[PDB]
Structure formats: structure tokens, C-alpha cells
Scaffold this active site. Structure first.
Site, mmCIF file in Angstrom:
data_model
loop_
_atom_site.group_PDB
_atom_site.id
_atom_site.type_symbol
_atom_site.label_atom_id
_atom_site.label_comp_id
_atom_site.label_asym_id
_atom_site.label_seq_id
_atom_site.Cartn_x
_atom_site.Cartn_y
_atom_site.Cartn_z
ATOM 1 C CB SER A 15 -5.661 0.915 -0.796
ATOM 2 O OG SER A 15 -6.347 -0.288 -1.129
ATOM 3 N N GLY A 19 -11.090 -1.449 -2.145
ATOM 4 C CA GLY A 19 -11.330 -0.053 -2.493
ATOM 5 C C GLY A 19 -10.335 0.988 -2.005
ATOM 6 C CB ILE A 21 -9.203 4.822 2.044
ATOM 7 C CG1 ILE A 21 -9.649 3.331 2.146
ATOM 8 C CG2 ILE A 21 -9.621 5.623 3.132
ATOM 9 C CD1 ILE A 21 -11.062 2.949 1.649
ATOM 10 C CG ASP A 126 -5.868 -9.435 6.061
ATOM 11 O OD1 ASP A 126 -4.787 -9.977 6.404
ATOM 12 O OD2 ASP A 126 -5.933 -8.612 5.128
HETATM 13 N N1 LIG Z 1 -7.216 7.465 8.547
HETATM 14 C C1 LIG Z 1 -8.258 6.558 8.404
HETATM 15 N N2 LIG Z 1 -9.384 6.710 9.198
HETATM 16 C C2 LIG Z 1 -10.415 5.810 9.137
HETATM 17 C C3 LIG Z 1 -10.340 4.697 8.254
HETATM 18 C C4 LIG Z 1 -9.172 4.514 7.408
HETATM 19 C C5 LIG Z 1 -9.009 3.306 6.481
HETATM 20 C C6 LIG Z 1 -10.055 2.438 5.794
HETATM 21 C C7 LIG Z 1 -11.557 2.623 5.700
HETATM 22 C C8 LIG Z 1 -12.511 1.566 5.962
HETATM 23 C C9 LIG Z 1 -13.932 1.847 5.851
HETATM 24 C C10 LIG Z 1 -14.366 3.207 5.474
HETATM 25 F F1 LIG Z 1 -15.652 3.527 5.349
HETATM 26 C C11 LIG Z 1 -13.438 4.267 5.210
HETATM 27 C C12 LIG Z 1 -12.029 3.970 5.323
HETATM 28 N N3 LIG Z 1 -9.427 1.423 5.143
HETATM 29 C C13 LIG Z 1 -8.128 1.647 5.379
HETATM 30 N N4 LIG Z 1 -7.812 2.728 6.145
HETATM 31 C C14 LIG Z 1 -6.473 3.142 6.478
HETATM 32 C C15 LIG Z 1 -5.496 1.992 6.702
HETATM 33 C C16 LIG Z 1 -4.072 2.433 6.961
HETATM 34 C C17 LIG Z 1 -3.572 3.472 5.936
HETATM 35 C C18 LIG Z 1 -4.574 4.626 5.688
HETATM 36 C C19 LIG Z 1 -5.975 4.117 5.414
HETATM 37 N N5 LIG Z 1 -8.141 5.501 7.527
#
Ligand SMILES: Nc1nccc(-c2c(-c3ccc(F)cc3)ncn2C2CCCCC2)n1
Length: 292
Positions: A15, A19, A21, A126
Site C-alpha cells: 500500500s 491507495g 498497490i 514523508d
Molecule cells: N514493487 C513496487 N514497484 C513499484 C512501485 C511500488 C509501490 C507504490 C506505487 C506508487 C505509484 C504507482 F503508480 C504504483 C505503485 N507504492 C508503494 N509501493 C511499494 C512500497 C513498499 C512495499 C510494496 C509496495 N512497488
């Protein structure tokens, strides 16, 4: 399911702020992706504002490229290149201890990510280990910053007039790494992202910060204990047993005026000069790169 005609939605992997993910695949391009889904419903449309910030940051080193932003069915959706493990994930994988070399090689890239974001008129607000992710493939050793959900403009695009100094603000970010002034309710600015980075670095050095683990009752008064402990802990104490460079960094950050342009180069030099004094090689190998 099937999103944006071109993608296939996978299972939930995490997350972000605002939102959920999910893992996914760009079928047409043969690419694995990360997909963030936001209801087009309620009260707040954050995914779309955040998407414009990413595009304004596209092109910078270590800023994830957005492949598609759009809405479909019940969701606004943003598709991003898949990225690797977060620094918190890696910290755990490395037995919650990073060597000084790794800390310094992380500080170098982290200070630059923040400088880049600042160069485009925004402050992150953040800075924490979970918002930094390593890349994959050719970009395996590149540290990416993500999540502009709580980001805000600090100066006017055209004139570069800095936002006004404001007080009585509620905290925005993670209490554990928030700056002192942020606890005092002062509007966050460039210095604040950097101070937080200072706590993240010392966090990597110690395994935990001294204001962590305090018990309280409200879930608002723990921030008072966090704030008081943070204020009651002089920098020399927090950094006792580590290169002077860390305290100099934190001290530099707390000394910046609300609208001051930080000297990012000077902060990176403190660490590079330390990198040299310790004798470390410039092979850019991070601790986790040695996991056999
Ligand atoms: N593996 C991966 N690759 C790319 C993005 C993200 C992602 C996004 C994120 C932000 C913008 C978007 F368009 C899509 C995903 N927000 C949090 N995470 C991670 C934080 C650590 C834990 C796992 C989710 N994760």
C-alpha cells in the site's frame, strides 16, 4: 482482472499513501508492473494530483516512470515500472544492520533524490525507509524514491516565491522520522526533508532510534512522547559512537532557515570525504549484494 486493456492485475503487494498497490503485467509490452488503484468515489481524489507530480519529476534519476494513468471501472489507476525491495525490507534482510559503507553509499543517492524533488518545486514530507526502493535489472543498484501522496509545492513555479512560514500545523509524515520543527507544528520546507533523512541514516546505524518504543494511551500523546524524547536528546548523544559526519549533518539541517536553499553538495561531500577516510572501495556494492 483486466485493467487498461493492456494490463492484467495481479495480487496485492503493498500500500502507499491513499491507495492499494498490486502486481501486474503489461501484456502488450511484455513488462511486469506495479499498479496503484484509487476509487474514483470519495471525498478525495489524490491519485490524480499525485500523478501530475510524478510526470513533473519524470526524467530525473531514480524517479519511477508512470506508464499509464487513467480510470477504469470503479478505479483511477496508475501503472508504474515494477521496482524491487524497499530499504526497510533490505534492512531486515541484512539482519537489521548495514555496514557504514552501505549507509554512506545510500546517503549519497538519498540526498540527491531529495535535491531533485526540491529542484522541481516540491517537498516530499514523508522521507522514510519504506519510501525508498531499489530498482531491478540494469538499475539494480539505483535507489528510487516513491509516493508523492503527501508532497506539496514549496515555491511558485514561475517566480519561485517560497510558500509562507506557518504555525499550528498538524503532523504530516511519519512521527518516527519527522523533524523537530514539524513536531512543533511549523510548515514543512526543504530543510525538513533533509532532517528526516538524517534520522533515517542514524536509524540504519543504530537499528532503532531512542524515541521508538514509547508507550502511551491516546495515539496522539505518543507523538508528544516522541516529540519530547526527540527534543530532549541532544545530537551528540544520538550519534555517540559513530563518525562525526552524522551529527554534523543533523546539526546542519536544524540550522537551516525555513526558506533556505540547502547546500546539498556540501552534505554529500561530508559523507564522500568520510567514505575515503574509512578506506572503502568505489565498487558500489551494497551489503545485500553479498547475500549468498
Ligand atoms: N514493487 C513496487 N514497484 C513499484 C512501485 C511500488 C509501490 C507504490 C506505487 C506508487 C505509484 C504507482 F503508480 C504504483 C505503485 N507504492 C508503494 N509501493 C511499494 C512500497 C513498499 C512495499 C510494496 C509496495 N512497488
Amino acid at each position: 482482472l483486466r485493467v487498461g486493456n493492456r494490463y492484467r492485475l495481479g495480487r496485492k503487494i503493498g500500500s502507499g499513501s491513499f491507495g492499494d498497490i498490486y502486481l501486474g503485467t503489461d501484456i502488450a509490452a511484455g513488462e511486469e508492473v506495479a499498479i496503484k488503484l484509487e476509487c474514483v468515489k470519495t471525498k478525495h481524489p489524490q491519485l490524480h494530483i499525485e500523478s501530475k507530480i510524478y510526470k513533473m519529476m519524470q526524467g530525473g534519476v531514480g524517479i519511477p516512470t508512470i506508464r499509464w494513468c487513467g480510470a477504469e471501472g470503479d478505479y483511477n489507476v496508475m501503472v508504474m515500472e515494477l521496482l524491487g525491495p524497499s530499504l526497510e525490507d533490505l534492512f531486515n534482510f541484512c539482519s537489521r544492520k548495514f555496514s557504514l559503507k552501505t549507509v554512506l553509499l545510500l546517503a549519497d543517492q538519498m540526498i540527491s533524490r531529495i535535491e531533485y524533488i526540491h529542484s522541481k518545486n516540491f517537498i516530499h514530507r514523508d522521507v522514510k525507509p519504506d519510501n525508498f526502493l531499489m530498482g531491478l535489472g540494469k538499475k539494480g543498484n539505483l535507489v528510487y524514491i516513491i509516493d508523492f501522496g503527501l508532497a506539496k509545492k514549496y515555491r511558485d513555479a514561475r517566480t519561485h516565491q517560497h510558500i509562507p512560514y506557518r504555525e499550528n500545523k498538524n503532523l504530516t509524515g511519519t512521527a518516527r522520522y519527522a523533524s523537530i520543527n514539524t513536531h512543533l507544528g511549523i510548515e514543512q520546507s526543504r530543510r525538513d526533508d533533509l532532517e528526516s533523512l538524517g534520522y533515517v541514516l542514524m536509524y540504519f546505524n543504530l537499528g532503532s532510534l531512542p524515541w521508538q518504543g514509547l508507550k502511551a494511551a491516546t495515539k496522539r500523546q505518543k507523538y508528544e512522547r516522541i516529540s519530547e524524547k526527540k527534543m530532549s536528546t541532544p545530537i551528540e548523544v544520538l550519534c555517540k559512537g559513530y563518525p562525526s559526519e552524522f551529527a554534523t549533518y543533523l546539526n546542519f539541517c536544524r540550522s537551516l532557515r525555513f526558506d533556505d536553499k540547502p547546500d546539498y553538495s556540501y552534505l554529500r561531500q561530508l559523507f564522500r570525504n568520510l567514505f575515503h577516510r574509512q578506506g572503502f572501495s568505489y565498487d558500489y556494492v551494497f551489503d545485500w549484494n553479498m547475500l549468498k
